[PDB]
Design a protein around this ligand. Structure first.
Ligand SMILES: CC[C@@H](C)n1ncn(-c2ccc(N3CCN(c4ccc(OC[C@H]5CO[C@](Cn6cncn6)(c6ccc(Cl)cc6Cl)O5)cc4)CC3)cc2)c1=O
Ligand code: HEM
Length: 529
């Protein structure tokens, strides 16, 4: 008789439901804990799954160790498991594929296989607004990138260079952090100065003079408020009825409204030239199926572009200053190049002369090697994926994670990878190079292969289109810093470690340097109060 047993099943269920609150809570925690461990042990038997990093806390997974030191986490996992492994992260399964083959697996993945917008939209859509970037099909993203790229041309860079330079000099003149007309030396936190110089220079050139002028007003606080919504938390909790979530939403409306006001004014007065990215999107924001971007979508796109350029660039120029603060030999070498290319300062800086500054560009290139702003790029897997030359299948609903910044720091691909050396790029100073065949996903011909161990700007359909703007902006900024100042560390201070829990791998603050004027008597002209 198994009927007796079946009765006692029902009996036990009833005795289970009648447990005292103490055991119920205990079982509420013990039961999922035990199942999680048993599920992992069983999971490890599958040969059609990459190894899964073991974890104790259900749902949480490896989030703490991954979040604090992802490259150390990746190195340990790589030693135990090789280049392909999974780990649980706040309810999601991330499948990591390290090295150039991982770049290929994820950046060149078929459009049907993975989705960037499914990984990213819940964060970006609240900050930028509806209809653009990840709040739209990939084919719309492809053309938005084409629109923006049409404003980021050599001719645009030629006119951005003197504008960015004016903004840097104005910042040296007026910012409390410098005031070069009044002080010949001082101490700055580069995580204060660089966000400010970045937003001032990017506003002036991409958004134009009106939007730049707005940052000298209370309006600037909206950018700060909107900036707070750009945090990895939004990957988990994109919306919570908390205050800073509402300040973010309000900022997005207020800022996009400011942009729309300007757009509608310009159209009303027929004042549509070729000054800035706003002009360009007003003239060139019609999809190939004939639909026009709305004024709201244009403004949302402007927010996304400005916010994306903001954090990558400001972290990168901070890192450049930090690495050079302990390398007075590199500052000297860069200074000699400035004197040579600009004839002792008798030539004004232009976009073309910037391209004749290989050491300066190598300094940016090397900083981006050692400090990839984005340590982990993700896609959500939409269809099961066979990992070539393995028996592994990545099922739909998993996430794939690619980390070119991890490979940037591997000795095998960059000898003495943890040493800052701009001369490893001698006779190779371009921001990136297409080493073979090319392909066009909708926004211009880019490298077909994505197997370079150096991939600061990603590859494939989601490849960065800001790279040349970033080099222009960082180039102008660093040319002027080098020609104007020397800098060094407070005693006993050195390059800080990266903060891998922020949106970008910015330096852990406060990160202070001491600057001094190369020409204490040099004055910056212009009006100021
Ligand atoms: C909770 C416990 C704690 C210990 N913990 N546990 C885990 N973590 C953690 C894990 C991972 C991460 N992150 C860091 C951020 N990261 C990430 C950030 C941005 C990103 O952007 C990719 C897309 C979307 O944004 C942009 C960024 N960009 C590109 N170029 C310039 N910016 C983008 C592209 C285009 C446009 Cl228009 C705008 C933008 Cl912002 O590209 C991708 C990954 C993911 C991992 C942070 C913390 C923790 O802190
Ligand atoms: C040092 C500076 C920068 C670095 C290292 C960088 C890096 C990257 C990377 C790695 C990606 C791909 C993300 C992924 O594959 O998930 C990307 C995408 C992108 N970035 Fe940048 N970026 C920088 C600056 C900028 C700037 C200044 C802009 C705009 C002016 C910009 C706009 C974009 C856009 C539009 C995309 C396309 C995203 C997509 O198609 O999904 N970036 N960037």
């Amino acid at each position: 008789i198994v009927g007796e047993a079946l009765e006692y099943v029902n009996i036990g269920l009833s005795h289970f439901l009648a447990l005292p609150l103490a055991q119920r809570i205990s079982l509420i925690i013990i039961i999922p804990f035990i199942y999680n461990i048993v599920w992992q042990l069983l999971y490890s038997l599958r040969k059609d799954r990459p190894p899964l990093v073991f974890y104790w806390i259900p749902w949480v997974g490896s989030a703490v160790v991954y979040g604090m030191k992802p490259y150390e986490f990746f190195e340990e996992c790589q030693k135990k498991y090789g280049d392909i492994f999974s780990f649980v992260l706040l309810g999601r399964v991330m499948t990591v594929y390290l090295g150039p083959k991982g770049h290929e697996f994820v950046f060149n993945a078929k459009l049907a296989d993975v989705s960037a917008e499914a990984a990213y939209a819940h964060l970006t859509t609240p900050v930028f607004g509806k209809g653009v970037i990840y709040d739209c099909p990939n084919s719309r993203l492809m053309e938005q990138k084409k629109f923006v790229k049409g404003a980021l041309t050599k001719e645009a860079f030629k006119s951005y260079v003197p504008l960015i330079a004016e903004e840097v000099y104005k910042y040296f003149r007026d910012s409390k952090n410098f005031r070069l007309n009044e002080r010949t030396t001082g101490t700055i936190d580069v995580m204060v100065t660089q966000p400010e110089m970045t937003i001032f220079t990017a506003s002036r050139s991409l958004l134009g003079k009106e939007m730049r002028a707005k940052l000298d007003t209370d309006f600037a606080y909206l950018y700060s408020d909107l900036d707070k919504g750009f945090t990895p938390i939004n990957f988990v909790f994109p919306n919570l009825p908390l205050e800073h979530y509402r300040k973010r939403d309000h900022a997005q409306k207020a800022i996009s409204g400011t942009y729309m006001s300007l757009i509608k004014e310009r159209r009303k007065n027929n004042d549509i030239q070729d000054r800035d990215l706003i002009d360009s999107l007003m003239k060139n924001s019609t999809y190939k199926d004939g639909v026009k971007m709305t004024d709201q979508e244009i403004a949302n796109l402007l927010i996304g572009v400005l916010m994306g350029g903001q954090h990558t660039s400001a972290a990168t120029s901070a890192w450049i200053l930090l690495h050079l603060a302990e390398r007075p030999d590199v500052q000297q070498e860069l200074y000699e190049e400035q004197m040579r290319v600009l004839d002792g300062g008798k030539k004004e800086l232009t976009y073309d002369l910037l391209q004749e500054m290989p050491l300066l560009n190598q300094t940016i290139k090397e900083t981006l090697r050692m400090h990839h702003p984005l340590h982990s790029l993700f896609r959500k897997v939409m269809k099961d994926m066979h990992v070539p030359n393995t028996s592994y299948v990545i099922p739909a609903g998993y996430h794939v994670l690619v980390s070119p910044g991890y490979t940037h720091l591997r000795d095998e691909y960059f000898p003495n990878a943890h040493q800052f050396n701009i001369h490893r790029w001698n006779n190779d100073s371009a921001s990136s190079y297409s080493v073979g065949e090319e392909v066009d996903y909708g926004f211009g011909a880019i490298s077909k292969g994505v197997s370079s161990p150096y991939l600061p700007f990603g590859g494939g359909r989601h490849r960065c289109t800001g790279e040349h703007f970033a080099y222009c902006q960082l180039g102008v900024l660093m040319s002027i810093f080098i020609r104007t100042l020397k800098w060094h560390y407070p005693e006993g201070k050195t390059v800080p470690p990266p903060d891998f829990t922020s949106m970008v791998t910015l330096p852990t603050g406060p990160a202070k340097i001491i600057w001094e004027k190369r020409n204490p008597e040099q004055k910056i002209g212009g009006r100021h109060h």
